[PDB]
Every structure is written in structure tokens, then in C-alpha cells.
Design an enzyme around this catalytic site. Structure first.
Site, PDB file in Angstrom:
ATOM      1  N   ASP A 112       7.686 -17.604  10.790  1.00  0.00           N
ATOM      2  CA  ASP A 112       6.741 -17.476   9.688  1.00  0.00           C
ATOM      3  C   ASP A 112       5.913 -16.217   9.916  1.00  0.00           C
ATOM      4  O   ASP A 112       5.118 -16.168  10.856  1.00  0.00           O
ATOM      5  CB  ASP A 112       5.840 -18.705   9.603  1.00  0.00           C
ATOM      6  CG  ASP A 112       4.754 -18.569   8.545  1.00  0.00           C
ATOM      7  OD1 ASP A 112       4.915 -17.781   7.586  1.00  0.00           O
ATOM      8  OD2 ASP A 112       3.729 -19.264   8.679  1.00  0.00           O
ATOM      9  N   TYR A 234       3.058  -9.661 -15.319  1.00  0.00           N
ATOM     10  CA  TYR A 234       3.211  -8.766 -14.182  1.00  0.00           C
ATOM     11  C   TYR A 234       2.059  -7.809 -13.923  1.00  0.00           C
ATOM     12  O   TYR A 234       2.008  -7.200 -12.859  1.00  0.00           O
ATOM     13  CB  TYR A 234       4.534  -8.009 -14.274  1.00  0.00           C
ATOM     14  CG  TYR A 234       5.724  -8.913 -14.071  1.00  0.00           C
ATOM     15  CD1 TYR A 234       5.971  -9.501 -12.835  1.00  0.00           C
ATOM     16  CD2 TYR A 234       6.591  -9.195 -15.122  1.00  0.00           C
ATOM     17  CE1 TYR A 234       7.052 -10.339 -12.652  1.00  0.00           C
ATOM     18  CE2 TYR A 234       7.680 -10.032 -14.948  1.00  0.00           C
ATOM     19  CZ  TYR A 234       7.905 -10.597 -13.713  1.00  0.00           C
ATOM     20  OH  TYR A 234       8.985 -11.424 -13.535  1.00  0.00           O
TER      21      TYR A 234
END
Ligand code: NA
EC number: 1.3.1.44
Length: 397
Positions: A112, A234
Site C-alpha cells: 500500500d 473532470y
């Protein structure tokens, strides 16, 4: 010993075909091996290295001429009793196989990237074994972030009102109307935590202060701007807010790296490509399908690997000076947003129907790219051939 098929569940393919993934890796490698070629990077760190832009980045620096050694950080899972494994899991493995055949270092950290432990581990490897890094590419597109132990989840929403329009249903070969609505305050913040520039900046600081960057090192993150048609998502929406955070952090990283090591940081704004996460967001997938047709007709179409190759050889590591837009961003969407291209997209949009869309847009190419993401529909792969699951279990990153 089993046959892997493309089963759709709630719009997404369940399994991946590992050897289809191998072939896709090999296609990208082949493109890079045959391209004009560039030089520069020697030691490269990529966070988010297992797929999409991170993978294309890794393949490009390794096979595109620099013969770069690479470290890839990604979270992926392999085969178990019940699961075949993620595409990224296999991309990592097959990348490493092909890179080593060329005598290159290709380290994988299956980890991670958000955690301090992972940073420490990577830093330790750089100091002990790898050597200083001249290029750091941050291309993690994680759905969530674990922190104390708060979990933040990225969302794709507007900040005001509804956003609705056509998506492409690949399973039925049809257009389907969809809607996304306004995000909560907490959702905006969480998306900023996951998709913004915070983790990238942490990485750059740890790397910098631990003496892990070469003098004049470059670091890059990726973004998308697109056409006004999808600005609500976006630029103005949760993703747009996160990307502006990313852009703001790029500036602060740039200033620091410049002052300390004569290095630099910037965001590269890339073009529209088919991805799982944008499938089913309203109005983007149809835009992409039309865009593909227009740009292919105009001989300026690029997939992921082509984008990256041109970015490196023509803009970043070229003879000539690098040109940014007025906000310091590298623009790889320069062809996408070209006036003639956008004029044609808007024209086709005005004629496109649920009936005629496969003829007026590049649905075939859109679908193929979607299938390829799970290792399906790759030319030269025998999909009637059964897969050895115990052999796949043996493969290590
Ligand atoms: Na990536």
C-alpha cells in the site's frame, strides 16, 4: 486446469486472462522497442506501476531506449483457491520477466503506497541496493486510502446538480443513459485525500530528505482535463477538485526540488483513454469512442503506451526545451483538444443516436480496449486453451 471466460457482473468483467495480460505487456514492449528511442532516465521509481499509465511509464523507460532500472509500487493480489488474480498482479510479473531477460533490475513492492511503512521499505531499498533515483512517477489511481485508522473513499460526482448522459454498455453493445449527482462535503474532502497531491508530496519529501533523488531529478503525476462536455466531472466535480489539489502540490514540489537539487515536478495532462473507472460515468465513454474514430481518421490516435512514448521522447527528454501550458502543466492532450478534432467530435455528437453509434463512433476499438484491460480479445492469444492455475500460482513478483 481451467478455461477463463469473460463473465460480466454489474457491467464489469469478473476474471482476468493472465496470458492475455502477458500479451498486452508484450505489445507495449514491442511498440517501445521499435519506436525512435530516447535517453535520460537510469533509475526510476513508479508508484502505481502495475497498470495504465504507470505500467506504460515503466515499459517506456525500460524498453524505449534508456534501459532504465525500475522500482514498481502497486497493490495487487494473485491467484488463490477461488480467484485468478488481478491484471496488475500479472502485469508486474510479466514485466519483470521481460525486463530481466534484458538484464535490467525490475523490483516490485506489492504494498500500500499510502503507508509510512511502504515509503520506509522503498527508501531502504534505494539507499541499500538500488542507487539514487532520477525519475519518480506517481500514477496511483487507488479507489480508497487508509490513514487514526480512517478510510477515505474516492467518488466521481459533481459539486452541484446532476450530470447525465450516454455510457457504453459493452456487454449488450448499446448506449445507456446514466446519471451522477452532487457530492457531500465529506465526499469532496475524501476524494481530495485519495486523488489529490498529498501522498505524492509525502513521497517526494521522504525521498528528498533521505538523499534518494539524483541531482536534477524529475517527478511527474498524471491528470486529465478533457472537453467542456465533461467539465462538470473532470474540472468542477470531485475529480476536478482532487486534480487541482494535485496541480497545486506539483508547484510546491517543483519549487522545493528546484531549490534543493535543481530538480523539478510537474503534472502531465493526458488524453482520453478507455478505463474501468470512466466506463459508466455519463457522457465520457461515448465522447472517447467518438474521439477514437476522429483521431484515427486524422492519423493522430494514441493509446496509453504511445502517449507515454511521445511524452518522454518528444517533450521531456528531447533535444529541445520543454514547453508547459500557462499553468506549468505538460499537455499530452494537445492532439485531443486540437480545434479540428473537437469540432468534428461535436459535429458527430449532434448526429449520434442509440441506433447508429457503432457506425459514427469507434465502438469496436472502445470495446476492444475495455476487454484488453482484463486480458481478453488480444490478437494472437488462444482463448480456447485451458489455463494451468497451479503454474500461475507459482509466479512471483
Ligand atoms: Na497507473
Amino acid at each position: 486446469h481451467m478455461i477463463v471466460k469473460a463473465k460480466f457482473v454489474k457491467g464489469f468483467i469478473r476474471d482476468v486472462h493472465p496470458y492475455g495480460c502477458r500479451r498486452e505487456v508484450l505489445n507495449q514492449i514491442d511498440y517501445c522497442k521499435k519506436a525512435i528511442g530516447f535517453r535520460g532516465p537510469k533509475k526510476v521509481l513508479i508508484v502505481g506501476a502495475s497498470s495504465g499509465f504507470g505500467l506504460a511509464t515503466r515499459i517506456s523507460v525500460a524498453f524505449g531506449g534508456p534501459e532504465a532500472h525500475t522500482i514498481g509500487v502497486s497493490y495487487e493480489t494473485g491467484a488463490t483457491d477461488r480467484r485468478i488474480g488481478t491484471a496488475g498482479w500479472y502485469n508486474n510479473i510479466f514485466f519483470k520477466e521481460f525486463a530481466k531477460k534484458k538484464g535490467l533490475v525490475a523490483k516490485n513492492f506489492i504494498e500500500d503506497a499510502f503507508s509510512n511503512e511502504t515509503k520506509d521499505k522503498v527508501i531502504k531499498y534505494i539507499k541499500d541496493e538500488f542507487g539514487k533515483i532520477d525519475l519518480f512517477v506517481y500514477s496511483l489511481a487507488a479507489p480508497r486510502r487508509k490513514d487514526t485508522g480512517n478510510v477515505y473513499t474516492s467518488r466521481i460526482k459533481t459539486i452541484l446538480g446532476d450530470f447525465e448522459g450516454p455510457t457504453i454498455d459493452v456487454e449488450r453493445d448499446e448506449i445507456t443513459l446514466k446519471k451522477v449527482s452532487s457530492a457531500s462535503i465529506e465526499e469532496i474532502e475524501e476524494t481530495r485525500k485519495v486523488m489529490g497531491g498529498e501522498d505524492w508530496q509525502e513521497w517526494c519529501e521522504e525521498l528528498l530528505y533521505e538523499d534518494c533523488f539524483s541531482d536534477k531529478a524529475t517527478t511527474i503525476a498524471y491528470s486529465y482535463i478533457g472537453s467542456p462536455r465533461t467539465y462538470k466531472i473532470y474540472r468542477e466535480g470531485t475529480i476536478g477538485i482532487a486534480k487541482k489539489d494535485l496541480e497545486d502540490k506539483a508547484k510546491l514540489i517543483n519549487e522545493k526540488l528546484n531549490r534543493v537539487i535543481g530538480g523539478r515536478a510537474f503534472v502531465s495532462v493526458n488524453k482520453a483513454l478507455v478505463t474501468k473507472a470512466s466506463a459508466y460515468i455519463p457522457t465520457f465513454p461515448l465522447y472517447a469512442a467518438i474521439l477514437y474514430k476522429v483521431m484515427k481518421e486524422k492519423n493522430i490516435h494514441e493509446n496509453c503506451i504511445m502517449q507515454i512514448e511521445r511524452m518522454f521522447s518528444e517533450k521531456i527528454y528531447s533535444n529541445e526545451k520543454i514547453q508547459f501550458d500557462d499553468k506549468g502543466r505538460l499537455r499530452m492532450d494537445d492532439l485531443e483538444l486540437r480545434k479540428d478534432v473537437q469540432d468534428e467530435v461535436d459535429r458527430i455528437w449532434s448526429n449520434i443516436t442509440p441506433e447508429n453509434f457503432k457506425e459514427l463512433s469507434d465502438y469496436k476499438g472502445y470495446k476492444k480496449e475495455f476487454m484488453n484491460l482484463n486480458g481478453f480479445d488480444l490478437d494472437g492469444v488462444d482463448y480456447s486453451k485451458d489455463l494451468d492455475i497451479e503454474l500461475l500460482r507459482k509466479l512471483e513478483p
